[PDB]
């Protein structure tokens, strides 16, 4: 309720930008989780971290 | 020192233009990212770095906070970045920099590093197939899918030879090879019999999951021995100061019976009497070490050579396949430049490409002899567009449903000119064979919808969050209506006696958090829910009357 | 009721203490039921 | 809520099950209706006024 996803008229929506920033962090953390699960070469994991 | 004279001139006149910084930048730095990082470095003093000649009042109105410690550490920075030229923090630029350091590969270098991968996994399979309990698990697995508990031609990839009868032929080959070796252990040709037993498995073709199961199951049976090798050395050399030449000679090389340890409780040393500290500890490791010997058909030092064949062969090929992965990083960046502006950031498209690039290498077959830049281009076409499908919109759309819009975006653009002015929605029921409703909900779906710092604007610098109203709150007219209804019931229920008001307080949830049922209220008074239903309907009819419902009838919205 | 407000650095154990779970997927809502 | 399960059992009138998001004149303005235009989607048929 401090970064809401309010349903507007006609099917349209409206979010806050913190949703995009938290989505970026969750994406990069899940991908880094896989890249350290995968024993990847160190340069792409350096770039991921 | 020139940027120090820029600091001194800015604090000496109260402002900086773009001309003064651009005249006091050094000669070595070029592009506009680092110089406006320097503008931020001088701008949070703040000496008011703006475009033109500033006004007259707005140096006395604009303020200089906070002197001087932020300016002290900024002087520490700005007098020290006058030396190196290669400093930026952007992962895209530094990624280009640390990506150019890896050269490409030839065709011949690619296939020979591929055969380095092939002989590396061959050395891994040489270390795997040199162990018997994997093939005992292979026996019992073929036994359990002889009942077809799994699918065997999916459990293993047939064999490297399509047909279950030839899959029965090579498994009838196994159980005959297994009994001419294990039954004739009693040690001249028995290890040569395990040798012929090892040879017949390396032409069996399996699934990596049914391969990786026996690898990791002996991995926990390997580091347990490496825990045992820790269990001795953590408690001999430092616990008691037993010298490691007693560890190099007595344990290392023998490792098997109870003679390397428990005979050293009479070396007439401090550490020899100190083995009573660890005599009962490693007696648990004196059995569980030989328990592993009861689970291999060999000795512990022969297990130390088996996984060291496994580890070094894995460390060769995984480094070899990453040497192929690092080589084709220039390929992936060329692909992700074509998929860029469809929502996701540039570094995210690339890092999903190297994920498929690592997975393309694991399934690449150079025996087909095609180039690798044709195989991995399929996976990066998948994995970039899949993460564009999965992880780009704030509302996640399933992958095929994106392809429904993408086909609709590709078709309705084409019928914008092939039809005339506009394409109608009901016309799109004709072209694509979606019947006017599974085409309509495709266009109902929004697109990364709207920010709520969206400027309306020029009202009070008001944003779109200022005008969205909450409907799920409680308006204080309805709430005091609800509160006065609570007391208006309490006065109408003050007109009832002990029993009938109480059932009407526990048939509904009046000051109790149920709403008991007809039998449950009749459970309290041992009535079979019929008189309870009547005495509810008696009291309900009792509240039906005028000058009994003169306050409550007004409480209904009429 | 509180009489003072104290500022500090958040302990990682304290950040897990405020939490009511872990966010693992970057999905927001259901896209169909808006759930 | 409770005290509605008792009130709607007395008069027996059901929950309306639909809500009344309708268009009304805003507060204060008294005027004369001089046009009404009904625009319909093509999938929706019409009504009598349309």
UniProtKB/Swiss-Prot annotation, chain A:
The RNAP catalytic core consists of 2 alpha, 1 beta, 1 beta' and 1 omega subunit. When a sigma factor is associated with the core the holoenzyme is formed, which can initiate transcription. The rRNA transcription and antitermination complex (rrnTAC) consists of RNAP, NusA, NusB, NusE (rpsJ), NusG, SubB, ribosomal protein S4, DNA and precursor rRNA; S4 is more flexible than other subunits. DNA-dependent RNA polymerase (RNAP) catalyzes the transcription of DNA into RNA using the four ribonucleoside triphosphates as substrates. Resistance to the antibiotics salinamide A, salinamide B, rifampicin, streptolydigin, CBR703, myxopyronin, and lipiarmycin can result from mutations in this protein. This is DNA-directed RNA polymerase subunit beta'. Belongs to the RNA polymerase beta' chain family. It comes from Escherichia coli (strain K12). Co-administration of salinamide and rifampicin or salinamide and myxopyronin suppresses the emergence of resistance to both antibiotics. The lineage of its organism: Bacteria, Pseudomonadati, Pseudomonadota, Gammaproteobacteria, Enterobacterales. It comes from the Bacteria. Acetylated on several lysine residues in the presence of glucose.
Swiss-Prot record, chain C:
DNA-dependent RNA polymerase (RNAP) catalyzes the transcription of DNA into RNA using the four ribonucleoside triphosphates as substrates. Co-administration of salinamide and rifampicin or salinamide and myxopyronin suppresses the emergence of resistance to both antibiotics. It comes from Escherichia coli (strain K12). This is DNA-directed RNA polymerase subunit beta'. Belongs to the RNA polymerase beta' chain family. The chain holds residues 16 to 50 of 1407 of the full protein. Acetylated on several lysine residues in the presence of glucose. The RNAP catalytic core consists of 2 alpha, 1 beta, 1 beta' and 1 omega subunit. When a sigma factor is associated with the core the holoenzyme is formed, which can initiate transcription. The rRNA transcription and antitermination complex (rrnTAC) consists of RNAP, NusA, NusB, NusE (rpsJ), NusG, SubB, ribosomal protein S4, DNA and precursor rRNA; S4 is more flexible than other subunits.
Curated annotation (Swiss-Prot), chain D:
The RNAP catalytic core consists of 2 alpha, 1 beta, 1 beta' and 1 omega subunit. When a sigma factor is associated with the core the holoenzyme is formed, which can initiate transcription. DNA-dependent RNA polymerase catalyzes the transcription of DNA into RNA using the four ribonucleoside triphosphates as substrates. The lineage of its organism: Bacteria, Pseudomonadati, Pseudomonadota, Gammaproteobacteria, Enterobacterales. Belongs to the RNA polymerase beta chain family. The gene is rpoB. This is DNA-directed RNA polymerase subunit beta.
């Amino acid at each position: 309720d401090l970064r809401p996803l309010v349903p507007l008229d006609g099917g349209r929506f409206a979010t806050s930008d913190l949703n995009d920033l938290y989505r970026r962090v969750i994406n990069r953390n899940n991908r880094l989780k896989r890249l350290l699960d995968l024993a990847a070469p160190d340069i792409i994991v350096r770039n991921e971290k | 020192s020139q940027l120090k004279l820029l600091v001194t001139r800015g604090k000496e006149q109260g402002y900086l233009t773009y001309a003064e910084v651009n005249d006091h930048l050094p000669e070595d730095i070029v592009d506009s990212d680092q110089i406006e990082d320097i503008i931020q470095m001088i701008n949070d003093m703040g000496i008011q770095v703006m475009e033109e000649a500033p006004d007259a009042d707005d140096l006395m109105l604009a303020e200089n906070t906070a002197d001087e410690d932020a300016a002290e550490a900024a002087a520490q920075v700005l007098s020290s970045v006058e030396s190196e030229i290669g400093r930026t923090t952007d992962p895209v630029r530094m990624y280009m920099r640390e990506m150019g350091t890896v050269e490409l590969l030839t065709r011949e270098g690619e296939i020979d590093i591929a055969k380095r991968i092939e002989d590396g996994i061959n050395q891994v399979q040489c270390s795997v197939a040199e162990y018997p309990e994997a093939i005992t698990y292979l026996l019992e697995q073929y036994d359990r899918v002889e009942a077809e508990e799994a699918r065997l031609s999916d459990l293993i990839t047939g064999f490297v030879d399509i047909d279950p009868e030839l899959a029965r032929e090579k498994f009838a080959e196994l159980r005959a090879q297994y009994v001419v070796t294990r039954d004739t252990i009693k040690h001249a040709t028995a290890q040569e019999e395990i040798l012929k037993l090892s040879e017949v498995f390396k032409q069996f073709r399996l699934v990596p999951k049914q391969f990786d199961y026996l690898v990791n199951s002996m991995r926990v049976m390997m580091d347990r021995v490496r825990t045992q090798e820790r269990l001795i050395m953590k408690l001999c050399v430092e616990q008691c100061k037993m010298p490691k030449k007693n560890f190099i000679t007595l344990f290392t090389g023998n490792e098997t019976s109870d003679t390397w340890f428990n005979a050293a409780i009479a070396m007439n040393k401090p550490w020899s009497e100190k083995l009573h500290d660890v005599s009962e500890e490693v007696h648990r490791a004196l059995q569980k070490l030989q328990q592993i010997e009861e689970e291999t058909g060999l000795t512990i030092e022969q297990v130390k050579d088996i996984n060291r064949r496994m580890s070094i062969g894995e460390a060769k090929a995984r480094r070899a396949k990453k040497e192929m992965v690092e080589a084709n990083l220039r390929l992936v960046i060329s692909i992700a430049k074509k998929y860029t502006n469809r929502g996701l950031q540039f570094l995210d498209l690339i890092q999903e490409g190297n994920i498929g690039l690592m997975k393309a290498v694991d399934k690449f077959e150079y025996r087909r002899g095609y180039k690798f830049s044709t195989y991995a281009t399929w996976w990066i076409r998948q994995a970039i567009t899949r993460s564009i499908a999965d992880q780009a919109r704030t509302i996640r759309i399933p992958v095929h449903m994106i392809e429904t819009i993408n086909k609709l975006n590709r078709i309705s653009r084409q019928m914008l000119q092939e039809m005339g002015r506009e394409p109608t929605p009901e016309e799109l029921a004709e072209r694509m064979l979606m019947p006017e409703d599974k085409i309509r909900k495709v266009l109902k779906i929004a697109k990364e919808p709207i920010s709520m710092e969206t400027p309306i604007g020029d009202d009070e610098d008001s944003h779109l969050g200022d005008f969205i109203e909450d409907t799920t709150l409680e308006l204080p007219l309805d709430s005091a209506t609800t509160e006065s209804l609570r007391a208006a019931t309490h006065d109408v229920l003050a007109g009832l006696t002990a029993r009938e008001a109480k059932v009407l307080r526990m048939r509904f949830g009046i000051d109790m958090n149920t709403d008991y049922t007809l039998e449950e209220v009749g459970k309290q008074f041992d009535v079979t829910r019929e008189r309870i239903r009547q005495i509810e309907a008696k009291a309900l009819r009792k509240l039906r009357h005028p000058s009994r419902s003169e306050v409550l009838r007004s409480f209904l919205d009429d | 009721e509180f009489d003072a407000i104290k500022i500090a650095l958040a302990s990682p154990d304290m950040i897990r203490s405020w939490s009511f779970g872990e966010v693992k997927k970057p999905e927001t809502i259901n896209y169909r039921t808006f759930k | 809520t409770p005290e509605e399960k008792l009130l709607r059992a007395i008069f027996g009138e059901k929950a309306s099950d639909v809500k009344d998001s309708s268009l009304r004149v805003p507060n204060g303005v008294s005027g004369t209706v001089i046009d009404v235009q009904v625009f319909t989607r093509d999938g929706v048929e019409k009504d009598k006024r349309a």
